[PDB]
Design a binder for this molecule. Sequence first.
Ligand code: RET
Ligand code: OLA
Ligand code: OLA
Ligand code: CL
Ligand code: CL
Length: 264
Amino acid sequence: KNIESLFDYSAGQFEFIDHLLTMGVGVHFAALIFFLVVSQFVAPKYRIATALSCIVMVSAGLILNSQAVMWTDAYAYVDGSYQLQDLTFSNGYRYVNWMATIPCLLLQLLIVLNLKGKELFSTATWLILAAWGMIITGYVGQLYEVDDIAQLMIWGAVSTAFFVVMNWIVGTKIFKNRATMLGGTDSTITKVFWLMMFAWTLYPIAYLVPAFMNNADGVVLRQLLFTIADISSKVIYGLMITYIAIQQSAAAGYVPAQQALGRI
Ligand SMILES: *C/C=C(C)/C=C/C=C(C)/C=C/C1=C(C)CCCC1(C)C
Ligand SMILES: CCCCCCCC/C=C\CCCCCCCC(=O)O
Ligand SMILES: CCCCCCCC/C=C\CCCCCCCC(=O)O
Ligand SMILES: [Cl-]
Ligand SMILES: [Cl-]
């Protein structure tokens, strides 16, 4: 059902995708240790934001590791190329994982924006429903990326409408609550918004590769785009969130955060 199953791969293509996925595992688990160790410098009111980064690192790291092993299970070197065997490889497992990781990425943003109480709960609910609508309609669309490109496009348009509305909610909350943020992080948080807009827009570009580059090099490109996007949207983003959490912690008087920042 997916374009990966259509092609034999050169050794260079096959090895490069394997190395991409494996490097992605290493980066996420390396970053996990960082977020774990610095969580003791985050004030209680923000510490869940850094815990969420830990959860996202393991969740994303496990899906990338599962994809890497599925890639090597599915293909074997036969008659000079990597050819599909009895098991298949597909990107559908990424979509299922996004059902958990996208809410985690959004929730840590809302925590450092200082939303609390009812506004936090209600903003998180609408965001998570919009994200789940995006993910589910995209998952259906990519079931047709070989059989029915028209259908891929239409479900992709519906998914993109949820994406746009979600981003509208996020941006409205950022620009509305910028003013509450401590330690100069009202300037930082706007950069986080732009980082999200850039990095999350790479996923719909990967989703469209079947329409514009249906060949083995398009398969490689899609995994390359996922890799750039994953590291940007989860690791670099989490580092910025953690920086904002620690900076606001210090400005609110949390002594471990003041001492951590002073040490650098
Ligand atoms: C770490 C994973 C992240 C940040 C996943 C982000 C996924 C998206 C923003 C998916 C977006 C889509 C569209 C906007 C339309 C095409 C179908 C999707 C689901 C790929
Ligand atoms: C900011 C996140 C960066 C993600 C790092 C991804 C690493 C990509 C490295 C450079 C790509 C150049 C490699 C050449 C690909 C050869 C294709 C082939 O083997 O046929
Ligand atoms: C086994 C896979 C091979 C690749 C292993 C990767 C080794 C880790 C390298 C750096 C990962 C980038 C994340 C950096 C952690 C945050 C620390 C910081 O920059 O302040
Ligand atoms: Cl606190
Ligand atoms: Cl993920």
